[PDB]
Symmetry: D2
Subunit: 492 residues, 4 copies
């Protein structure tokens, strides 16, 4: 498969009540190609004026007697299935948008990102009419049962590293439970989300059920975060910004909050692991999606006996990593998202050099246009170094060394982040000892980034609150109502 | 049974690491008898220095490979079953200690409060080894499972409405999941919790698993909220302080938060019901626990056919409600908790007379000695009156009128709270339409505040976040960890 | 919608390994139009020889490393969704087949049976990747989890009253869990099942996963019931044959057994109920699909206060019930399935007149061709009469009177059949009383025949073993394997 | 703990309605200690007349509105926890009378059989109030929920090799769900079950909730199977009788059947495991309880590299096992249950020495101090010997040899039995591939026989139907009833 030639950007307006609207201020903002820097198009810039309108529509679409509220639970699933069909039909167009907007390699956005989007919508389409309450045997002459209802208007804010995928992970479980959505995609990458508005209208969702508002964080985002008519907010996923999301939630109307924040995920490589397999898996664990994943990956602990051999082949693998244009089927790594990310990475690269880390390869930017960075590897990294803490959303792999399994566990847990961990060993005792001792929401054994629509995802400690994906992602978007009836009889 | 004669307050210290301690400052605050104003005793006053030492004890008792961690989950239940036995043994003392401290009648404290305290422990004693994760059939050659691990150190702040019940409702699920507890009772009523520390040590819980710290809210409670070493705060109290708890969690720790806030809960009485049963149940929905209940039936909606009849028996019975010492067996209504709330119950009962509301009996007090307030009935209330919109933690009963069911549904959900609602009818259709239409976490049909260890609670909107009790109460003290293992084949 | 004009019966051979085979004996058997008595086509007759080939085809398709065993669970759902897509395209053809071969009125086969067929496949298409095991916190240093694996080859026998719907109800849950199927439709109505064989091959199901063998009971059915290579049997039909299935299973290989055996389901009409609603619903619960429903409300208990006028309204409703050709849109009632059922109904109608029942209307066969019978009503049918005890599969309504809820509860339960119940009342206490105090797998309140893909349904006593549909239908097609790992330290 | 000195069998009569009765015939049957051959006491011999009397008692205690029905589910749990207390109190008495009757070493019966009994009662004491149904979101104006209700009278037939452990594993889940029980202990060892009848009436269970009917299989056991007043049967015994049980059930009233038939469980041991640990767990895998376990533990495969070192340390441990009297503390092996069981395994011991298999030790006995067969170790056994395929419930170890993981999985699955498996290895991929490829209900990794109260236990293939001893054990004793109510409007 190949990218769409030229490709027209048809959808650049605000999506409210299934109509394309201009911004109330008339303003727009540009969207760039991170591989070249060219301005790709311009998008309506939503502000508090537009956010209030979408909440108004989402509230009306959620009132009793509404088509969305009345709709059979199985029919909410059929709409999700219909949406997944339109995404598969336009799988090549949406993958091209993700490449042009996010700098992701095309074949990556086609076989990974778009695959996850389709499978997420298909998975949650099956959960619609299977969200069960319970009947409970309470003391006394009572009949007590439990109803799971939708909370209401759900404001959602998603980031730029996985634009379409995060868009799916946010709306699929929320619609599955019958909520209405007001979602703001990242200002850098709003194109794939706006195209989703066209498919949503094509699938037949009632008006106002899904309202997409592109705009900036301090404007549209802060309007959502403190809106008194919004009942639940879901944010992804900077740990710093997430502090204010949960700050404005409590100061406004006490929304229920879900967070999917960052992490400095460790990756333990015991000496008794498939060496050729571990070096490639730890490399893809760091360098996938230009290092722009919350599930990196940065801290790689390797046992000393195989440390110098692991470092050697990791450097060989990093040097041959093909960095180039996203539309090229040989490219493995695209550019970074923007200049601010590009600057912050090179700063963090220079901090490691100025602190005793061995720069084995790379170290600076690539080319003159866009935001390409060399695949770089820092050796002899210690726990106190600046690059040891501080997540680096870039292609920088950092290899540490360790003795004793008890030491690597204490160090890998010695962190305020607890999103993800990965251990590589062939001893079942070592694998289950570490995985049960890790303070992380997802722990992979002999793999990395093994994500799926069936397995829940989310971090420990300051890596987020609540879990997405799987059945446990449905618990974020429901509200338990208990009903107790006085019974004359009461029998078993 | 009979109140314990000449009972001394043996435990007035601070419970850290299964030991009694003084304030690091040496400060001390007094506890009062609201039926009399007498100073009961003096308790140590904890603060940031003492809270820090409680977190250190709780963090060590939660350490990997601790006694509390390696312990079989089944013995976690037998430890909680043992606590229930000690409470059952010392039942008369605790009901006495709750009567002298909280101002509740001894027999109600004996038959209601402690019956629920005992049941809550025995209930969660069985859940301890029945906390289940899941193995997920997932795409690709993988084997994915989850394990429900305890979050960690849990800070808990309970009010004075039910000093012992709220204490049990908090620590029972937390310890059942395997957490450590840094709990802070209310300033007015910290004694029943301090005796529990003795039973806790007597039962055999390892030192540090439960830390009881009496003190002031803005002094000790804020130290729990802002402590970077606490993984989760669970708060029950006023809605305004719950917003700060929400804000204090985002400003510092991003800890998981469970709030349980105010009420102002509707009580819909239909014409086809039993007036004799509905009058008394609605009367006990207001005046139970001296009107100091988050689930108090504030607004009563009576059908137009039977309203003036409803008020007649209501006011009639409300003149027979005995208000006396909480130790006389005939007494049903004790005193209000203290002077700040005593004056507040009256400033708003003045607002009722000041507005179009029509008083039908009481409204002043008794002189007496403590903080006793007359059983007051109001009538011909309108929806916009301040009193039909202010959470009154006092024995005042406001009785409205309604015509159609569609009107009473809109008038009931028109409030920012949403903890509780109740319907009284014999019609199957009216009982089910109204019960589903309400926006509350708990809906009763032909009963009121019939709670149990089973079934969750609750509830909606600005009244709380999450649910205690039932199975779902456990979900707020667990932590879901996903483990994915690469497998060579994957069959089935 | 209109029936397909002159319909080709294209698929009349045995379906094994996604191929069309002739009978090893070379025999064929005829299929008849129950409304005209004329022959429709000839079908290959499956015997013990053909059953043997199907078993080894289904056994081979279930072997480790096969396509069906290694396929993602989500893809087993994709194939089920595609199968539902192919049914909705050929919805008019299959409804024509079922109307032609079963005597059902066309519009009712199009809007009820075919709707349930589609909704069933869609519902179970979602369950595939959502069948979860559990992780259990057991005593000692262990890690215990559970997998739900498919049982293996499932033999299934379905009746003739809902040929297509029973076909979907049986193969959807079995395929959802990953089993292979050997299914034998009733000899009277094998055609729509054989057309499903073509859709299965078109949908892309691997060969041998589904095998359809049309034939007779003592030949095809008996060979399935006693096959040593078949792991589970699922029979739906008469209670008499249900005893032989559970017997042959014990004599062969102790294969698991599911039974749906029907019964004599009561319908209780209280004077508190909507009379005109209950008259119409209870008349639908007796006469639906020519009275050939296992859930038929054969015994209608009516309160004496409204007995004589409920009876009269029912007689008027029966006298205007339109009987005619299944292809005519005005027809509500078609013919019975064959001469054997036709005679059994006419003999039971004679027993009612003999034992002293008031034949209020109808009671004799209508016309010369086909197997049409007049709508029939009885009265004062005391519990000892034969029509009150024996299950009638015909358009015969039987009305009893009662005096007390406690009396009608005991009378309705006095039966070896406990499949389905129904109470009509507007009081919630009476609705809770009967529904909880009855021995029936499904209790409908103020409705009848409200079947879903989401609700279980099954027998209590001699009316079946286990359930189908809902979540609980899946547990009858899954083996639970427990895996326990000795782990080093174990930290709960 | 020492065995009770001169214990007298106080309880010798049949237990019906919490009363001791004699047999309706007056016939009695003698019970023997197989470690002395001397007759110990005489027990009333139950038969059809006594079985009919117990069913009528069991049916009345289950009738609607009874004490057992109306009783709160949580108090059903308190009654179970009370039984566990009395068992731990009379722990010594129940221990010695299990060694006197069953013939097991006293400290084994004290620290194994009794530990399992107390944990089983206390594990199911918590499940009683936590059996939940579910509310279903179905299509249309309906509200659908399910209730998990007890089936009714349940007949149980435990074997002789774990009289008290099987007694708890049977009645605890049944009573947990609210059933009534008619249980028949083994004719070889009925005494400890009879004492439990005293502890039952001591604990306070209503009369008739549990009835103990000591007798013979072909006499009283068959009266349970063929009784039309019993809604469900649970066997546990030999595969041959279990086939007859499902025939007697299908021939009568279609009662639900769950069997625990046991068989030839394999045990794989790879060369990368600790030999000290592997040979010891393999010894106790087939030598525990004098080899009279369903698991067993029979076919022990060993990799080539360590086979002739495995047998060296095995025959060391075999001739080191101190056989003797059950009361001697230094005794590890006891006597077989009786002479016919003693006679069949010697008939099979010669069916290896004569079938070409090599013997390593034992193979005779030690006199006639009882029915003692000395620790015997085989070697060089092939798969199609009568020894490696049949019912050797004695202390016979069968050490096989295998080469490839693929080969031993075929050779281990090649069995009509397959109740349990076990694999010893440190390789993560080996332990995962083998454990998933096994056709067994329980498979252990680096352990054996590690049964716990929390984990379900059952059999695959022909040993056979149903699961017990977990959450899923509850499913076996509950009936699912669906309740659907027509509501005025959806709103979902
Ligand atoms: C959240 S709350 O602080 O607002 C509150 C509200 C109501 C009650 C309450 N109230 N009553 C009550 C009793 C009698 C009458 C009368 N006449 C009126 C009310 C009973 C309860 C109650 O929870 N029981 C209970 C029972 C079993 C287990 C358990 F854990 C708790 C307690 C606290
Ligand atoms: C179904 S069965 O009749 O085939 C059978 C099989 C194994 C055992 C068994 N065996 N052992 C065992 C003990 C020691 C040694 C040694 N050395 C070897 C095996 C322990 C058990 C056992 O169930 N424990 C248990 C523990 C806690 C709770 C509970 F509910 C059950 C019992 C019956």
């Amino acid at each position: 498969p190949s990218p769409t030639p030229n490709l027209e950007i048809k959808y650049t307006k605000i999506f409210i009540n299934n109509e394309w609207q201009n911004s109330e201020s008339g303003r727009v903002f540009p969207v760039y190609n991170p591989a070249t820097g060219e301005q790709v198009c311009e998008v309506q810039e939503a502000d508090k004026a537009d956010i209030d309108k979408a909440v108004q529509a989402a509230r009306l679409a959620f009132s009793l007697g509404s088509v969305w509220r009345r709709m059979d639970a199985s029919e909410r699933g059929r709409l999700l299935d219909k949406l997944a069909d339109l995404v598969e039909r336009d799988r090549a167009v949406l993958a091209t948008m993700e490449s042009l907007n996010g700098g992701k390699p095309f074949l990556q956005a086609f076989y990974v990102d778009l695959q996850g989007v389709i499978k997420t919508f298909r998975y949650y389409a099956g959960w619609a009419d299977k969200i069960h309450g319970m009947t409970i045997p309470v003391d006394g002459d009572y009949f007590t049962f439990t109803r799971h209802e939708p909370i209401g208007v759900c404001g959602q804010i998603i980031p730029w590293n996985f634009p379409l995928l995060m868009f799916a992970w946010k709306i699929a479980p929320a619609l599955c439970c019958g909520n209405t959505v007001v979602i703001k995609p990242a200002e850098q990458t709003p194109l794939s989300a706006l195209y989703m508005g066209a498919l949503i209208k094509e699938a037949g969702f009632p008006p106002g059920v899904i309202n997409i508002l592109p705009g900036y964080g301090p404007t549209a985002g802060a309007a959502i975060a403190s809106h008194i008519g919004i009942d639940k907010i879901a944010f992804t996923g900077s740990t710093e910004v997430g502090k204010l999301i949960q700050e404005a939630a409590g100061r406004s109307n006490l929304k229920r909050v879900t967070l999917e924040l960052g992490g400095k995920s460790p990756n333990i490589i015991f000496a008794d692991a498939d060496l050729d397999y571990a070096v490639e898996q730890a490399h893809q664990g760091v360098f996938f999606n230009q290092g722009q994943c919350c599930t990196a990956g940065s801290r790689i602990f390797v046992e000393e006996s195989i440390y110098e051999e692991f470092v050697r082949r990791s450097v060989e693998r990093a040097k041959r990593r093909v960095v180039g244009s996203p539309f090229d089927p040989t490219t493995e790594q695209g550019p970074q998202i923007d200049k601010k990310q590009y600057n912050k990475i090179l700063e963090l690269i220079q901090s490691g050099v100025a602190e005793g880390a061995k720069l084995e390869c790379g170290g600076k930017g690539l080319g003159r246009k866009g935001f390409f960075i060399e695949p770089t590897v820092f050796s002899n990294v210690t726990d106190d170094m600046r690059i040891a803490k501080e997540e680096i959303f870039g292609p920088v792999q950092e290899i540490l060394r360790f003795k004793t399994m008890d030491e690597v566990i204490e160090r890998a847990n010695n962190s305020d982040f607890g999103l993800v961990a990965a251990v590589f060993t062939n001893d079942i005792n070592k694998a289950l000892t570490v995985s049960s001792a890790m303070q992380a929401g997802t722990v992979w054994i002999n793999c990395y980034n093994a994500l799926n629509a069936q397995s829940p995802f989310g971090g420990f400690k300051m890596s987020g609150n609540g879990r997405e994906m799987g059945e446990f992602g449905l618990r974020e978007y429901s509200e338990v109502k208990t009903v107790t009836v006085k019974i004359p009889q009461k029998n078993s």
